[PDB]
């Protein structure tokens, strides 16, 4: 696969022949350097990648007189390339509590399989085949996030998931979904899906995705909601589900 990305990257840079070859050298040198920084904290490595993005984006416009309109495409090609290559080294580092967190969240979600959409006031009626299918399609995308290496592709999965969510809500209510309808539905989808390495995926995106795509409202709104969904689940309690500590503890055990 990576060879496919390398070919696509090299072929893509010839398109800009002049500046292209230059960017390729800079990119190859950045990776060579990251090899020597493998032992640093994931935060610092994230900083090297974030700086690399910034510095290369400001080196074309100037030295290459490249149109600020074509830059975006290029940057996406660069992220695809380097992240496709760093993935094995920066995703869920043994040097972080990423794995311990993936496990706690997984165990946590697995212990909450008794939580119903009703308890969460979720505007989703799975007794309606169409809605049920929307729900499973949503889960599919959230789960497939883990199989993607590039942060942008991981984001695309989150977006595809949320779009199935809105249709599930639309069909159930027979009208457009309200603002307050989303988050509860996403929490439900995550509870029923228990997405692989949820915490590692969230951190990876936050660490190596071009920040320009995370708080711009586009995929940023969806990403923020998923983080908010995980946090909601982490601290979910009796009152949270609209119950008395009594009931809650009953379910949680028996
Ligand atoms: Mg889909």
Q: Which run of H or of E encompasses 47? A: helix 42-63
Q: Residue 228 phi/psi, 5° resolution? A: -65, -30
Nearest to 251 by CA among 107, 106, 103, 116: 116
CA of 194 to the centre of ligand 1 (A): 17
Every domain range in the chain assigned CATH 1.10.246.120:
1-94
Q: Which residues surround ligand 1, an ion (CB under 5 A)?
A: 137, 141, 160
Angstrom CA distances, 103 to 100, 189, 243, 250, stand at 5, 18, 26, 24
Give, to the nearest 10 degrees, the angle between helix 42-63 and helix 198-208: 40
CA of 15 to the centre of ligand 1 (A): 32
- The CA distance from 132 to 168, in Å, is 8
Write down the CATH number for the domain with range 1-94. 1.10.246.120
95-254 homologous superfamily: VPS9 domain (1.20.1050.80)
- From the CB of residue 87, how many other CB atoms can be counted at a distance below 10 Å? 17
CA of 130 to the centre of ligand 1 (A): 14
Our separate counts of H helices and E strands in the chain read 11, 0
CA of 212 to the centre of ligand 1 (A): 25
Cβ–Cβ < 8 Å for 40, 95: no
Cβ–Cβ < 8 Å for 81, 5: yes
- The DSSP code for 215 is S
| Dihedral sign, Cα of residue 211, residue 108, residue 101, residue 88 | negative
The distance between the two most distant Cα atoms of the chain, rounded to a whole number of Å, is 70
Cβ–Cβ < 8 Å for 170, 161: no
Cβ–Cβ < 8 Å for 190, 142: yes
CA of 208 to the centre of ligand 1 (A): 24
Nearest to 51 by CA among 15, 82, 96: 82
- The CA distance from 109 to 192, in Å, is 8
Every domain range in the chain assigned CATH 1.20.1050.80:
95-254
Cβ–Cβ < 8 Å for 52, 30: yes
Angstrom CA distances, 187 to 174, 182, 193, 225, stand at 21, 9, 10, 9
């Amino acid at each position: 696969e990576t060879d496919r990305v390398s070919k696509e990257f090299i072929e893509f840079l010839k398109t800009f022949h002049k500046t292209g070859q230059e960017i390729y050298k800079q990119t190859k040198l950045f990776l060579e350097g990251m090899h020597y920084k493998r032992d640093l904290s994931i935060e610092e490595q994230s900083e090297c990648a974030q700086d690399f993005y910034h510095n290369v984006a400001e080196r074309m416009q100037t030295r290459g007189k490249v149109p600020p309109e074509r830059v975006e495409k290029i940057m996406d090609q660069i992220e695809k390339y380097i992240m496709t290559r760093l993935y094995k080294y920066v995703f869920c580092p043994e040097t972080t509590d990423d794995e311990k967190k993936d496990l706690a969240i997984q165990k946590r979600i697995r212990a909450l399989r008794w939580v119903t959409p009703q308890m969460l006031c979720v505007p989703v009626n799975e007794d309606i085949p169409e809605v049920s299918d929307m729900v499973v399609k949503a889960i599919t995308d959230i789960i497939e996030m883990d199989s993607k290496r590039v942060p942008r592709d991981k984001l695309a999965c989150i977006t595809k998931c949320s779009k199935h969510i809105f249709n599930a809500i639309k069909i159930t209510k027979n009208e457009p979904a309200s603002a307050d309808d989303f988050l509860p539905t996403l929490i439900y989808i995550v509870l029923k899906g228990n997405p692989p390495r949820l915490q590692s995926n969230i951190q990876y995106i936050t660490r190596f995705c071009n920040p320009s795509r995370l708080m711009t409202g586009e995929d940023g709104y969806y990403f923020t909601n998923l983080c908010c969904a995980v946090a909601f689940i982490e601290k979910l309690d009796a009152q949270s589900l609209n119950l008395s500590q009594e009931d809650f503890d009953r379910y949680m055990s028996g």
